[model samples]
Target chain A: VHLTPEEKSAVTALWGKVNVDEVGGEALGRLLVVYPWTQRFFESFGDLSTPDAVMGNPKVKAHGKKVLGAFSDGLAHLDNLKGTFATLSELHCDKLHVDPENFRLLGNVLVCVLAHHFGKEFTPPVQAAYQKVVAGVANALAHKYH
Target chain B: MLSPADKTNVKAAWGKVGAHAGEYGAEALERMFLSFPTTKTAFPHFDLSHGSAQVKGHGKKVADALTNAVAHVDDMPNALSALSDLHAHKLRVDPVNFKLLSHCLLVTLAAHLPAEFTPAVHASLDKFLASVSTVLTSKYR
Candidate 1:
């Protein structure tokens, strides 16, 4: 789907903040703690039973930054977003066989962290932009799991 | 309030300052933890024992965010809101800690940019940062 100028601008402007890796890392740390089903994706972490275990795991942090970085990169290329998310979809759906529902769950976790990180900048325009972005990715990947 | 010309100059000066963001950001955070030991509670797993990786990483993170704010000075209020909530809610960040870090940034800049870090530059940068600081900490009020 094509994104409006306002949508693109809001998404781009919001990402102007540096250290998105940490933002990704923070969100991943929260997701594993609150969303248990999501943990199956990261069997490499051994045991993610506690907050410290999740946060301190280098493997988990790397995955967090890589996945979120891909999402952030893909948001900019909505014109070719299908192609963008497809690479990730291939890895998660084909290779690892991650549940598509986890995309929605991860979206929820990202929103909380985004709200926490971005605060007032999470305005109506930005929220609208994000909803479209998240739904677009999830819907594209929807057919994969089934 | 910086003039159009001043913003350009400020951007250039600050851009030069940012090249060494990792060190400067690290110094600012170091100063903050020194003045306020309790603020470290936000990062339960990260180390804050001075010169550690976590401290430097976080320092660069804040530094990058600060410079990003500067780049979007015109959109300060709108731009900062997104980050405001992160520190406020996710970390339960103490507003005082932001102030402490601001002070430390000034100290770090002054030391790093001894030639260009003039009173006029200081005042201009201060006002610009003040606008950002207001939005960032507004949640606390």
Candidate 2:
């Protein structure tokens, strides 16, 4: 996939904060493939413009619309997590209900893996800035969880 | 990262494949109907045989659309995004059911395509499946 410069930077910066040894390359690749797949499935059902439509059933249509809305909300939640490391740390502690250290490891691994996969074409400064945010998030999680 | 040219190629391929939407569309509906027999409760107005026929026709249309769509792979994300929006709004089929249908479609493709097309098609399908799985898990969570 052709990642934009901004996306590339985001990926590289994210990559810098994780322990790659914990999450192998194969798992990371699988995650990358899944991201688009999830987006596509949601996209396919959301379109109502054609003769061969998915929302032909009113009930199904209503439910799908709601689900899509909820999903968008979830994306927004992730974005919020990006800006509020403390909140993320709390969520990891309370909501995730998993061992804090494990959560930190998993979160860092995912961010880094995404960055490594997508950071090929980014500029140095942009990539560094991106890494800073991810590292901050990772550090916050490590402190709170560990 | 994909090169601009590679992205273009991807879009072309997606367009070529998407053009044949009808080919898989009907089958998709049929399988959906069969697998989730409860779905029949939602379409009481339609006769079983008639619905089957309709789905078959749609499958062919989808297949043709896919063939054309795959020709423009670079535009795949757009094409797919359009379809995603439609499904998200209209069908609203449960994520699990959608996955079941996709599994059926890929299997059907595996049965029909020549050996040469199998690997690439399988890889593409794998990617699709991965995404679907993630969406379902995330949604459920």
Candidate 3:
């Protein structure tokens, strides 16, 4: 899908507002709250099984940052989505076993976070554009799943 | 620091081997875990078998992180210090296992980049991995 110049600009601009690590980290914690069953994949969380426990755990938080870093790297290098997406799909689909449904939920949660980050500038058009972008990302992430 | 020839070919190897991030990572992680079975403690719940989904998936994650880490090898301080801290302080994984993974990756990379892989390239990769591991394990101090 072709991203409009305006749409790209909106995402690029909103991303500029916050550090990628912070955005990714925050988005990950939210991913847990919205989709708690995904927690089994994180070994670093020890015995902490609940969403609140995972969010509070530092290792889990770092993994959250790592996930977004993958997305951030993919966004910057769209021309070479092969490696980026391959890596993302491998981790998410194989080891993590995050069902396809959670990816969509996480994508929505990410947009919601970006919307808040975008603040007053997050107009309807911006949200619409980002919705497309997030959906595209979720699709790519789930692409390699069998 | 890598020689021009070493840097060029190793990156070429990475370019070729990297696209199969999952497979490459699977091989390396499997190698690491096999060579050093004690590392399994870090993944208390992870399936240790070579063909297990968990092992292969984590293999990709490690490969991904190394790819990112290697890409920014020139900026080791800024690139890997946080990663090191995260793995060390936050995750509390053994730092030696990371170095072991680097070695396993080197072996893994050589298999795919056979024509280009060389002693020089291995040395360069070792040098880079050393830099990465040093920073990664700095938190242990």
lDDT of 2 by residue, A1-146 (tens): 13355655455454465433333433322322333322222343454333234324343345434422332232323444444456555664545432332333334444454455656644465555544444444554544432
DockQ scores for all the models shown?
Answer: 0.02, 0.01, 0.01
Which window of 10 residues has the lowest lDDT sum in candidate 1 chain B?
A: B117-126
Worst 10 residues of 1 chain A by lDDT: A119-128
**By descending TM-score, how would the candidates be arranged?**
1, 3, 2
Go through the candidates in order and give each one's C-alpha lDDT: 0.69, 0.46, 0.71
Per-candidate TM vs. native?
Answer: 0.49, 0.35, 0.47
Which of the numbered candidates is closest to the native, going by highest lDDT? 3
> Which residues of candidate 1, in runs, are more than 4 Å off?
B1-141
TM-score of 3: 0.47
Docking class of 2: incorrect
lDDT of 2 by residue, B1-141 (tens): 234544444344444445455755666667666765544433445555745665666567556545544444445455555555545544433344556666766665555544524455466554644553444334221
TM-score (chain B only), all candidates: 0.85, 0.56, 0.84
Better of 1 and 2 by TM-score: 1
Q: After superposition, how far is residue B1 of candidate 2 from its true place, in Å?
A: 9.6
Interface RMSD of each candidate, angstroms, one decimal = 17.9, 15.6, 12.4
**lDDT tens string, model 3, A1-146?**
37888777877777667677767777878776555444545655675556667567777668778878777766775444555587767776556555555667778888888877767888898899778777777777777764
